[PDB]
Design a protein around this nucleic acid. Structure first.
Lengths: 59, 50, 99
RNA sequence: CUACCCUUGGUUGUGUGCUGUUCUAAUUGGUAACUGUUAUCCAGUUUCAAGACAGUGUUAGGUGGGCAGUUUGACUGGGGCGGUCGCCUCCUAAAAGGUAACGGAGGCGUACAAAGGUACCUUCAGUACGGUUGGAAAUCGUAUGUAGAGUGUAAUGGUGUAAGGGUGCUUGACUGUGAGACAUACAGGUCGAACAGGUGAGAAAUCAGGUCAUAGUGAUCCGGUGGUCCAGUAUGGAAUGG
RNA sequence: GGACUGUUUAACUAAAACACAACUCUAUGCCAAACCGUAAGGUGAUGUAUAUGGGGUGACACCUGCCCAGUGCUGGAAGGUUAAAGAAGGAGGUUAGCGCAAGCGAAGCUUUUAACUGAAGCCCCAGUGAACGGCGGCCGUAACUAUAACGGUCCUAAGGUAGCGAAAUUCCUAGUCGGGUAAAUUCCGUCCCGCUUGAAUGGUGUAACCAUCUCUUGACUGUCUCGGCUAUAGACUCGGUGAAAUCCAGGUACGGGUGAAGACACCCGUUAGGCGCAACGGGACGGAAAGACCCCGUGAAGCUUUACUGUAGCUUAAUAUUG
RNA sequence: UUCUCGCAGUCAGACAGUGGGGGAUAAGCUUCAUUGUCAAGAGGGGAAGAGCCCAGAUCAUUAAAUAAGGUCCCCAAAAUA
RNA sequence: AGGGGUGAAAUUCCAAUCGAAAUCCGUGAUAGCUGGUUCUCGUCGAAAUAGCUUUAAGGCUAGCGUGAGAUCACAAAUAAG
RNA sequence: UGUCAGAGCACAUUAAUGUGUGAUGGCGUGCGUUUUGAAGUAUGAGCCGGCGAGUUAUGAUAGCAAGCGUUAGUUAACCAGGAGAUGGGGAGCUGUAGCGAAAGCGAGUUUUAAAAGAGCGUUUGUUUGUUAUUAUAGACCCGAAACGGGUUGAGCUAGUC
RNA sequence: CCUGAGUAGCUCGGAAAACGUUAUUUUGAGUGAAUCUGCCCAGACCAUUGGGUAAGCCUAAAUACUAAUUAGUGACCGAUA
RNA sequence: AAUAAAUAGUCAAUUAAAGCAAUACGUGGUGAAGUGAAACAUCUCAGUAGCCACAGGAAAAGAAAACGAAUGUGAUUCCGUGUGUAGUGGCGAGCGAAAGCGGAACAGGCCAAACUUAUCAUUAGAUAGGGGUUGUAGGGCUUGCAAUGUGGACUUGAAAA
């Protein structure tokens, strides 16, 4: 098979896995969440170990 | 359900700094805050806009 | 996965201005790996004999280094590292920054 | 005397379509006639009625269940109908927590430059008593009164020198964060040490990362606005973008 | 009930369905109107408004009440709005150039959505009931009781007219009443509280007619009271003949229980020598139809529409033909 | 049974006791939290019983002691006061 | 002569079968739904739960075991306090 | 409808507590299916024999093994060849330094005023054979009314001429 | 003196292009340039720069397949195949 | 013949495919569906299937108005790689490059025009010739030296293998 367009457009891979992704719930409704929440979800990260398994066998 | 949004931004560089709320029913008057500005890197008076 | 929105579609997208263009490339010369490499006055044609750079091509060269070496070599690369430049100058070699 | 320009009425002159028309030579004909052909068609010619229209082509309207494709949610102590679909407080609910119904109850799509922060000082609800308007209840005075008001509010818990009352400076209802924890599939969501800048308060102490806390919103696109140390399809910009 | 002569759902069913002569209405003046297709071409029609298409009802007698509020249909050109489209105009991008700076900006090209105009159409003004349809309540009131003739009353655009009224039409209700009927909830005439009747989805009747339905009766008889008999054919026996669904394997009793909740197979008692025939059926949840009942499937197919998106088609404007 | 990895699996459980809700505190009824069992687990006793009590089956074993429970007989064994 | 025809029109008919025939091709249509899946032995051993899901007979993850490896024990368990 | 006993009866073997039948005693509600649970009056089977349904192409993942080996290797398509291995052909792929969307920087990158903090880093190998899983190709397989295009059809029958 | 005219671009919809209409090629309707200092291309457009010279025609070469004939072949089945 | 003439038409003579088939292709035109998104209309399969026409044993495509962003190449076709890259798509399902490289094979030619000659009542604005196929611009024009040929996209004769 071939890789998925949505996946490659939303998954960033680097040395030894550790998929990079951003956090949603930030780009639409500013007044609906506090600035603390906004900057706390502004950064980047990697999904949990269970989802790490769910994505590792998927790509 | 209600709309109280107003944008407080800097005046020396015309930023868009903070979204806040202020009741228009009690007074439809401009509020001049004093808060930090990045492009000025200092506490300046911010003014309200739509 | 069964009917729930998929993981990606919940996540936002990543934007990149450089669309319709190729990424910037060079050929990189590591320092700790050229220790066993035994030849002074490196250039394009010299490295082809070791099969690290393609002959039927044309690509700028890049220099990287953070280790101490003693063999004096003369480098011909298009990008240099200042700390690596100082370290290789301590080896009595020479480095010219190509355009 | 004269160089420039405004309101209205005319006004030599043109560009144009529009309103009404005249003519056929474009064109239509299932007007009539001749020949092909001694043929209801058709071909050529003539005639007649029309005549820039009709029809035809395209574009774009209006109309158009004749037709094409589909849609018509879920839980249901038979089905349909009925009620609900989210958020938060108490009891059910087995003295941590967790934990069902189409259980019993209730509220929510908030408010606020003050009901915010800070510093100052101040401490009940009520009842009885005594008093012009003046009531069972107006305000004060004297006490007693220990939780029986209030701490925006539906409820819970706490709240008695308080988180309340008023006075004063104001606006941390900051910027960048952030170790460590909270409970969980995920999205998430909760507190938060501590630091940097630069502030307000008050002499400083230290506090201020919204309220006494627990409800008070929907991602992801897509399209849009300001700015951006960003890119700029050969070069520059622009455009198009991040 | 319907007028009938009739058309019928081959292989379940013939009428109160349809049909019909007739009645009513709309549209139509010749390349008629309409329809088939796409178009040639073709019917209507080798027709001409005493005719045709379509709509509705369905001898005949008599009538068909009101309302155009909403929908439709037609007329309407004043006013508001109205696409495609034609094009006022402007900024911008570039810079030949003015320039040390800031910036400025010629001409060509390029993105703009317009100024203005712009049809049909929509809004809107009237009509259109043999077009889609609809056509109410409440309270008080009579010198008999009773009853409600009436008066007041709100809404709607407007409040059931004639007629027929417990019918094929009344749930309450098997309502009466007078009947035939010894004894009548369906049979008849009448009474009128008519949920949600009612006048072209026609209505009230109408002589005849009916493989139509119902009611009472004449005669008639084995339908019954009330059962029996006769002769053929089978069935019975004998000879020739040679078929099925079904069927896990089986030498296959009962009471009480038991239990996947109804036992030939299990637990305790009871019963029965083995094997046929004439038999009819209680069971073996008998055989046959992965039920035709209901429900689920983001199953299928179909139908309707003020569901959605289009589209056949009709039709308007611009535009080429087109002067 | 702590961390990684491979790998299913189900989301229809059922019943008795225990505290319950609904119901009518009726139901082999439903809705939970606890123990236990079946499913996936044979056995004895309860007369015959998925569920109870006693219990957890490697094969042979005309050997024994035992658990619950039982000793007139069917059907295995007990009597004495 | 079926995206149709026919029809004094009842879903009438269109070779015994018609709310839209029969045949061929796409085509081995799809099927979250019934059906079954074929030799042996060795070891451990379930769940029938929560959330979400046009979600309800379906799917995902957390738990519920295993396969291998590592963690040596202040870890998890068994009891006392 | 058989098991274990068990006399009795008839006997004579792959020499073996030999075999065959069984008066009688004790015991004894089939095989799958799926269901909370099927001894069931849930279903499948009349019987016998034959046939009868998890492979392959490319791709990825995890495991096992071997070769090779830290500027490794494999060669792909292809060319010479019993259409053979192979030889040649190094085109490309993995790791060799990464950070991010980037100008670029670099044992640092980006976020930031930070040289603050945080993230990612701070080489730890490659190719095949094999097994299993996964991805698309009909992908364990049987099954429908389905949908679309084409085609024969008025002698049954409807109507008409 | 010449270098392919109702020609290209452009407007209203499209099609082919990784391509859903976007540079690039084409048209159902309309439209109307250029003359070598030309004109086109360089995923709108301009200047600059670089590349190119259509709007006429032809062209075996490698590559797809053996219904059919010949010689040979199969870790192809052996008459429910 | 209308219509004088000429036409149309009629008659006469010569030449062509006219058709069939290998379910295989290729070209051109026309042109559905269901599958998926566990729904579906945009989309997907898909210019799929299918239908028609054409010629061939091979066809089409083929000579820069090519690419493309480099002192880059210099018909075209086909195979791996590039590569699942850059990307495209209710940014959903899905869809898939463009150069380059390794390769098989590798031929470029022929027309009309300006310019001119002979023939069309030589108003032809046509017929047949010299010429000519263009960007390392070239041709026509005026005007010279040369060059004595090579290969084909190519004629039959003769022999041979």
């Amino acid at each position: 098979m071939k890789v998925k367009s949505a996946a490659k457009k939303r998954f960033k891979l680097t040395k030894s896995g550790q998929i990079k992704r951003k956090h949603a719930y930030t780009s639409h409704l500013a007044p609906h969440k506090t600035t603390k929440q906004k900057r706390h979800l502004r950064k980047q990260g990697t999904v949990s170990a269970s989802d790490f398994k769910r994505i590792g066998n998927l790509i | 359900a209600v709309k109280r949004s107003t944008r407080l931004g800097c005046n020396d560089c015309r930023e868009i700094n903070y979204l806040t709320f202020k009741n228009v029913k009690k007074n439809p008057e401009k509020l001049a805050l004093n808060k930090f500005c990045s492009r000025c890197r200092k506490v300046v008076v911010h003014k309200e806009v739509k | 996965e069964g009917g729930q929105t998929p993981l990606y579609r919940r996540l936002p997208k990543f934007g990149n201005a450089r669309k319709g263009f190729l990424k910037q490339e060079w050929v990189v010369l590591n320092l700790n790996k050229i220790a066993k490499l035994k030849l002074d006055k490196i250039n394009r044609a010299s490295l082809i004999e070791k099969q690290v750079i393609s002959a039927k091509s044309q690509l700028p060269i890049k220099l990287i280094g953070h280790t101490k070496l003693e063999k004096p070599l003369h480098f011909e690369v298009h990008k240099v590292s200042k700390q690596a430049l100082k370290a290789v100058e301590n080896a009595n070699g020479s480095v010219k920054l190509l355009e």
